[PDB]
Design a protein around this ligand. Structure first.
Ligand SMILES: [Mg+2]
Ligand SMILES: [Mg+2]
Ligand SMILES: [Mg+2]
Ligand SMILES: [Mg+2]
Ligand SMILES: [Mg+2]
Ligand SMILES: [Mg+2]
Ligand SMILES: [Mg+2]
Lengths: 62, 153, 206, 118, 262
RNA sequence: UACCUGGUUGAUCCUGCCAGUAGCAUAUGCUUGUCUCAAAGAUUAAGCCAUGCAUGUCUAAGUACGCACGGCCGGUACAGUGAAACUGCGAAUGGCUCAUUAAAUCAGUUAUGGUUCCUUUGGUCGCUCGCCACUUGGAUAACUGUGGUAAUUCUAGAGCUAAUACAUGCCGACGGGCGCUGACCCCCUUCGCGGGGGGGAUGCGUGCAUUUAUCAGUGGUGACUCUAGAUAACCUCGGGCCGAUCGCACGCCCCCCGUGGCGGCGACGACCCAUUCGAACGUCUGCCCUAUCAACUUUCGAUGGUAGUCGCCGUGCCUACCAUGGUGACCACGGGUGACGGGGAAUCAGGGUUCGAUUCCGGAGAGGGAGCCUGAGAAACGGCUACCACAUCCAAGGAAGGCAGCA
RNA sequence: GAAGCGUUUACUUUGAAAAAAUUAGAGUGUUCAAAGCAGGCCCGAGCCGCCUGGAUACCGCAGCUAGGAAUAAUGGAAUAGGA
RNA sequence: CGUCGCUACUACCGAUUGGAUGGUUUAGUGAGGCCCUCGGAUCGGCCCCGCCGGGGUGCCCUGGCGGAGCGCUG
């Protein structure tokens, strides 16, 4: 069958607890300071940081 | 009774019986030459298989089988079958989730050639894989060791 | 058709096995040969791989081996006298791989007469004068006679085979597979094997 | 339904016809098909009856026993040419072959010779 | 399946072909030949993906039917012919010859050879036996059999044969210290020297091979092939000399190359 | 990211669940400007299908006397382009679906010294003593003509004509060599004997493959009843091999002569061996729930032995005669599964819990069973035959079906 | 260098072998990314072409191999039928 | 707290030798294929041999009708 790939991953994760005053204030300050379109951009960079930090943590434990 | 207890003449096909026994030699007694082989893998054929009178086409030494594949060990459970016995192999099965083992067993019907006489329940046998000898028989006994026996009161 | 599959049998524990496919071709069986005694008749059957098998249905001639004398002759088959498998096979006179059959003793008698020059199978003689007298006398020279008279020493045959030759029928064993190779090759029974088969025939009828 | 030799009845019977029996050509190797065939016995119920004259009568049937038509093509195997023309051996065999003349009106006339074999 | 398979999936193709996974659904499916399909190069990918002489399978078909591709001294018109190990691909139109030897990464890389070298090719004696009339026959690692060999050549030895005749030129006895090449598994495409060999009756024998960098590994006897006597190879070794280097080493090589070339 | 919050009470600590919270995976609602990817009649019905397509195929190298073209270059077998048809091969791959299936499939491991194998590639094709060979016979296509039927990829009679279709069948090697049988001859201890041998006229079979029986012990195994030898024979009329084939440029020898004998490159073909592709059956270990399934199997093969039949092969695969065995609380057997198995997917402290119909691998199936032909390979279904269930046309005499292929 | 183990296991370490895709992950500016397996160097134009990659890790349990001998299981000579 | 009274909903039991839908085996019948033993509607060959006939010389080189050999065979 077809020669497609359909390999794709999400670049962001939604916060566990919605409607946190501290989290909403922090993210609104971030998007105001850096001119982002919406919360998905800061979530995607948070996910990138999480991946990098997880890799570093695994290497350090090794 | 005698060796020939079947409906046909039991004999080794490789061995030729009638080698023109005539008056140039005394008759007799000219004992029939015995066919045997070493099964390899360091196993030494028993002297019963060397100088016996039985015929077993499924015997590892005096029969038409070749031992190839896997060599296993087991404990003799029952000896109530003609030239075959059932052995029990006990092993441990790992369960990952509980990090613990599971005592299991698998009964195994194996052919026991008449070259092994002092075989009793509880003895540790080793078997080698061969061609299918019966419906549920695929292993042949090669060596027998006793288990705290050989001292009969 | 007839199948040789293992999955129609109960398993070792005795439980019933459910088939997971219908009868494949490679595990087929075919009707038995049931080779009889009569004029030659052989049917070719195509087998796996395009090869050829000879289902022989009737035989009359078989290549048999003396063994002790190392003489093999294409003699004829008389009938079936013993079978280890079933007595009905002997009743219906069917050739199988291990059946005991009678054969004519003429070719081996001729071999013995022409090789050892000992009259064998003849009680008194002087009845076939134009032929057998020539081969017993041969009016030959001295060196080949020196070669013959030593063969006279080892030309000793057991009384059982003597009686078989006197009777004219030699009992023997099939060795080939009539139904697979399409022939009925065999060897003459001798020694303790001959004694055991003789006592088996007497046990059937004595 | 064509009639088949050896059926030995009048009427139609269903027969499993294999390769090269009659009245059936296989669409693939080893194919067999159960077809209806009329028996070899002739009776009233027949559309046509095929008849072959074996011995000539006293007078000529109009358009049937006269005006002999030629075979479309002669022998092709050199053995068959020699058999037809009573050639013994090695006498102008390639030029004793029959040449078929094509003489269509719209094209120039010529004669065509067959490729001999063996 | 009811019979043999004559299709190969692109993802199911052997990894050493380095075929991508978007151009097509299927793989070349090499035709049957002297080599197993799992360790052979079809000529189509050898010409298209390796040398880039052709762009498509149709162009490979054109160059093959132009009768310019000669394998082991015989012209092969088969698109999916298994080129296999250490065979010689000769294009006399360009005068270029190649010998298919694995690299340190265990892949058939292009290894150009001289014409005076291409006339001969080593071979692994897979089995030895005798046929009718007592004539000895030798079956090699290819599907090639040769009659009448010297009795000093046994199983898993090596034979130096030549092209256009198929005769026996020389040989290598299997002995400790002989230089050998691994032709299968993890250590595939590594050049070393036979140091030890332990025999396991009824099973696979295991040899231990130490290379020029001191790296000692093990391999089954079935994957061991000899290309020299002791230290001198009888075949021009490909680039890298068959030494497998650690992951930091190619990083250092890449950085040195890019620093020098930047 | 190793996380919690509301709710029993007048109020407090708890237990405990309910609800909240986040992810994905189906459906659905509202809404939807751009662009790159990309799933998609699995769940219910492996229910039923109109219609169209999805497997055909030619190089110089099997067979062209089709006028369907045609160069003719002109007395000529065939220039060449070639329909159609015969021959060969393929159609057993792919594609689809997940109904069946619970030590079954399947995964890893190992074996076939217990089997077969189209094709590719490499070996073998003067290895046999044995009045056409400068080439043997017959038939059918295609094609012409006469039809039948309402109808089909339905076909009959008649007249042709070829093979790399179907058959048959030699020369050549080829001088002989070997093992028997040995007429007889010669040299012999010589003597009144044997004598130890050299020859030999006449016949008998010789090679590979098959089936027996026997003898001996060139190579390789861990281990052959292996391989290679030797002997005595068999070698099946639906009966093994021992080239009656085709193309390309064309050349050498000419004493004998003068028309013959010789040559290269291939293609096709083969009995057998090896290889490749495999396939098939086995070895060890591993599977969900269920005891409101605890004893099963064994008349009717259940476990094993002996000898056979069949099969490509090992084997209760099957038969005959025997023995009474075989499996179970370490869960047999039975039942269920909204179970095809695995690689994997979702979630993510660690450990786990669920999902894998779904593009890769293995299996199974083609409406449900069953049986076969051909072929190396099918129990094939875009092959056939029969029954059941559906269902198409008919002039009512019959004929024709298989979308879980793409739409 | 040939042979054997002064038991047999379990256990632990190493090595072989363990399809690809997917997982992690190396390199590469897809205009970034999801992806993909590519690509980069100069060209004064004749460069009458040069340099690379398509790693690596993981692959439970069972099976094979080579080291260890703590922990745990099983044994040797008691009527000596002992070495 | 329970009976009793009203209204809904939920399973349970029940005659119907329950009814119906369903999936495995015993006994009997049994299509079709395959195998075996017969069977021979036909289609060939040899002996053609009633004949004209003839060559190395009524001793038939063959060219065909036709009888049909009323046998032997595929
Ligand atoms: Mg021709
Ligand atoms: Mg299901
Ligand atoms: Mg699945
Ligand atoms: Mg699939
Ligand atoms: Mg199927
Ligand atoms: Mg075929
Ligand atoms: Mg079917």
């Amino acid at each position: 069958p077809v020669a497609r790939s359909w390999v794709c991953r999400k670049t962001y994760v939604t916060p566990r607890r919605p409607f946190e005053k501290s989290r909403l204030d922090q993210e609104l300050k971030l998007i105001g300071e850096y001119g982002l379109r919406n919360k998905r951009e800061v979530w995607r960079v948070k996910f990138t940081l999480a991946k990098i930090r997880k890799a570093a943590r695994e290497l350090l434990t090794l | 009774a005698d060796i020939q207890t079947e409906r046909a003449y039991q004999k080794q096909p490789t061995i030729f019986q009638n080698k023109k026994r005539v008056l140039l030699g005394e008759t007799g007694k000219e004992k029939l030459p015995r066919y045997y082989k070493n099964i390899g893998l360091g196993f030494k054929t028993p002297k019963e298989a060397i100088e016996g009178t039985y015929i077993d086409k499924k015997c590892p030494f005096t029969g038409n089988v070749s031992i190839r594949g896997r060599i296993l060990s087991g404990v003799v459970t029952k000896m109530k079958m003609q030239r075959t016995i059932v052995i029990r192999r006990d092993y441990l099965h790992y369960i990952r989730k509980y990090n613990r083992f599971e005592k299991r067993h698998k009964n195994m019907s194996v052919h026991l050639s008449p070259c092994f006489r002092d075989v009793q329940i509880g003895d540790i046998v080793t078997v080698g894989e061969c061609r299918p000898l019966s419906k549920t028989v695929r292993f042949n006994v090669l060596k027998v060791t006793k288990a705290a026996g050989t001292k009969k009161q | 058709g007839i199948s040789r599959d293992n999955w129609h049998k109960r398993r070792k524990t005795g439980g019933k096995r459910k088939p997971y496919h219908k009868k494949r071709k490679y595990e087929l069986g075919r009707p038995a040969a049931n080779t009889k005694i009569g004029p030659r008749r052989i049917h070719t059957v195509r087998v796996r791989g395009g090869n050829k098998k000879y289902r022989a249905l009737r035989l009359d001639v078989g290549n048999f081996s003396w063994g002790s004398e190392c003489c093999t002759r294409k003699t004829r088959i008389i009938d079936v006298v013993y079978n280890a498998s079933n007595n009905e096979l002997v009743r219906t006179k069917t050739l199988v791989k291990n059946c005991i059959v009678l054969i004519d003793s003429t070719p081996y008698r001729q071999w013995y007469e022409s090789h050892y020059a000992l009259p064998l199978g003849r009680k008194k003689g002087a009845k076939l004068t134009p032929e057998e007298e020539e081969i017993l006398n041969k009016k030959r020279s001295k060196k080949i006679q020196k070669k013959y008279d030593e063969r006279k020493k080892n030309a000793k045959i057991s009384s059982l085979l003597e009686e078989q030759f006197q009777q004219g029928k030699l009992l023997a064993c099939i060795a080939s597979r009539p139904g697979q190779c399409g022939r009925a090759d065999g060897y003459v029974l001798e020694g303790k094997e001959l004694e055991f088969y003789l006592r088996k025939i007497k046990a059937r009828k004595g | 339904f064509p009639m088949k030799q050896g059926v030995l009845t009048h009427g139609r019977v269903r027969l499993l016809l294999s390769k090269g029996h009659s009245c059936y050509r296989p669409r693939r190797t080893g194919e067999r098909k159960r077809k209806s065939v009329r028996g070899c016995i002739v009776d009233a119920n027949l559309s046509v009856l095929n008849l072959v004259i074996v011995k000539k009568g006293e007078k000529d049937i109009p358009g049937l026993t006269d005006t002999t038509v030629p075979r479309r093509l002669g022998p092709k195997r050199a053995s068959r040419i020699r058999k037809l023309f009573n050639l013994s051996k090695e006498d102008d065999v390639r030029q004793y072959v029959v040449r078929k003349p094509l003489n269509k009106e719209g094209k120039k006339p010529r004669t065509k010779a067959p490729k001999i074999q063996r | 399946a009811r019979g043999p398979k004559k299709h190969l999936k692109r993802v199911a193709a052997p990894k050493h072909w380095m075929l991508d996974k978007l151009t097509g659904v299927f793989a070349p499916r090499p035709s049957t030949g002297p080599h197993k399909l799992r360790e052979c190069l079809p000529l189509i990918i050898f010409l298209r993906n390796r040398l880039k002489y052709a762009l498509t399978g149709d162009e490979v078909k054109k160059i093959c039917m132009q009768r310019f591709i000669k394998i082991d001294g015989k012209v092969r018109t088969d698109i999916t012919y298994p080129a296999g190990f250490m065979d010689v691909i000769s294009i006399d139109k360009t005068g270029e010859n190649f010998r298919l030897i694995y690299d340190t990464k265990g892949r058939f890389a292009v290894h150009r050879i001289t014409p005076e070298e291409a006339k001969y090719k080593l071979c692994k004696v897979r089995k030895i036996f005798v046929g009718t009339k007592g004539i000895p026959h030798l079956v090699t690692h290819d599907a090639r059999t040769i009659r009448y060999p010297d009795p000093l050549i046994k199983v898993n030895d090596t034979i130096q044969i030549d092209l256009e005749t198929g005769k026996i030129t020389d040989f290598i006895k299997f002995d400790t210290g002989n230089l050998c090449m691994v032709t299968g598994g993890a250590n595939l495409g590594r050049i070393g020297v036979i140091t030890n060999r332990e025999r396991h009756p009824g099973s696979f024998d295991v040899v231990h091979v130490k290379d020029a960098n001191g790296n000692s590994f093990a391999t089954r006897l079935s994957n061991i092939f000899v290309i020299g006597k002791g230290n001198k190879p009888w075949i021009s070794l490909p680039r890298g000399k068959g030494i497998r280097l650690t992951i930091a080493e190619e990083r250092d090589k890449r950085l040195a190359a890019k620093q020098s070339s930047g």
